[PDB]
Ligand binder design. Structure first.
Ligand code: CL
Length: 107
């Protein structure tokens, strides 16, 4: 079945630069959205979703789900996960997560 590839375990970024967070899926099946989160708890923060939501700091770089986050500050430090969902009803359901990429900030 599908695997989620986050080739970087960590990215060091100087404050004020952009951060590139890389992700690929190995398959298009099951159909469902790919999202980026900061954190892996229930309280994780949605960082990017393609079809819905407003994410002004995020640009996408199909099996490539890599993103760029503009103007990084120390507050952006954390671990970022690229997560595949399967379509569900009423809600989509998490199918697989990438390993996470830690964003560290050089102040
Ligand atoms: Cl499917």
């Amino acid at each position: 079945e599908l695997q989620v590839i986050q080739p970087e375990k960590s990215v060091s970024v100087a404050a004020g630069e952009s951060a590139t967070l890389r992700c690929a899926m190995t398959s298009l099946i099951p159909v469902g959205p790919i999202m980026w989160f900061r954190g892996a708890g229930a309280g994780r923060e949605l960082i990017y979703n393609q079809k819905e939501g407003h994410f002004p700091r995020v640009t996408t770089v199909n099996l490539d789900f890599s993103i760029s986050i503009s103007n990084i500050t120390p507050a952006d430090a954390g671990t970022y996960y690229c997560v595949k969902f399967r379509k569900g009803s009423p809600d989509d359901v998490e199918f697989k997560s990438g390993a996470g990429t830690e964003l560290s900030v050089r102040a």
